[PDB]
Amino acid sequence: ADLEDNMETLNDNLKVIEKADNAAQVKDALTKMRAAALDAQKATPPKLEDKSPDSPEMWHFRAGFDHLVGHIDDALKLANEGKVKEAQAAAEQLKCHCNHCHQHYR
Amino acid sequence: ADLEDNMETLNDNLKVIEKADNAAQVKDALTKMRAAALDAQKATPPKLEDKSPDSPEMWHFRAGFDHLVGHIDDALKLANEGKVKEAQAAAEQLKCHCNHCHQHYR
Numbered sequence A, B: 001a002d003l004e005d006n007m008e009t010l011n012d013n014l015k016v017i018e019k020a021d022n023a024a025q026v027k028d029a030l031t032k033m034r035a036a037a038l039d040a041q042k043a044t045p046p047k048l049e050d051k052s053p054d055s056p057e058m059w060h061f062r063a064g065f066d067h068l069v070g071h072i073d074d075a076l077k078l079a080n081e082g083k084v085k086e087a088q089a090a091a092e093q094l095k096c097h098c099n100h101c102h103q104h105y106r
């Protein structure tokens, strides 16, 4: 799956979570988001073709995915506690990660 | 000044940026926030009062301030280039840094 497929999976499932009202719905959507984030985690965007792996910009780009995956994981644990509304609030806070990386790197 | 003082400074000046009557007040508020962030990085938050300086939690807490300072610096550069509306827009995005760290540790 390419970067665009992964990003639309992230986009759509954020809205599934908002639309949802039970724990299984939120868990399933976060699980889909986690897989999409992990899929996109390790590859290079266009605007960073000629960059070392440890260069500051690539470092921060990959750090963005790592941190998004951590907070998807944290939202998943709340869904697994049956804490639907907390997990929904955590998922909404994920939008910060989306915009931060986009403003840097897209 | 303690961590509560620093957070007041951050809260008041982030509002000042949103409400600034002139472009110069934006830069002044960013400058005060930068100092507040670096001071706060030297404190121990109450919810981590038992953790060693080497804990993963204290690491993420300190790192949040570095990243906040980095984006403050980006906004300062914009304000210093005369792109003060762009600086003000960037400053509004700093709220994500507040929300993220608070979700963990406030």
Ligand code: HEC
Pocket (backbone or CB within 6 Å): A003, A004, A007, A008, A010, A011, A014, A045, A046, A061, A062, A063, A064, A065, A068, A094, A095, A097, A098, A099, A101, A102, A105, A106
């Ligand atoms: C970097 C660390 C990113 C994070 C975190 C997120 N996104 Fe992203 N996204 C990124 C890039 C570099 C790109 C452009 C890729 C390209 O080749 O153009 C994108 C793109 C999108 C898109 C566009 C989809 C399309 O069909 O064009 C969307 C809808 C999108 N990203 C959404 C999105 C969401 C909802 C995120 C957080 C939950 C998110 N992205 C994180 C880089 C990064």
Ligand code: HEC
Pocket (backbone or CB within 6 Å): B003, B004, B005, B007, B008, B010, B011, B014, B045, B046, B060, B061, B062, B063, B064, B065, B068, B094, B095, B097, B098, B099, B101, B102, B105, B106
């Ligand atoms: C961690 C990396 C943080 C960042 C970035 C920001 N804040 Fe924060 N804030 C943090 C903690 C650990 C705490 C709890 C402090 C305590 O002693 O309990 C807070 C608290 C606040 C508060 C309340 C302060 C109080 O007197 O109780 C405010 C008003 C606040 N924080 C504001 C704020 C803003 C606007 C930030 C972004 C610009 C911001 N903080 C960043 C940790 C962190």
Ligand code: NI
Pocket (backbone or CB within 6 Å): A067, A070, A071, B060, B100, B104
């Ligand atoms: Ni975090």
Ligand code: NI
Pocket (backbone or CB within 6 Å): A060, A100, A104, B067, B070, B071
């Ligand atoms: Ni950044």
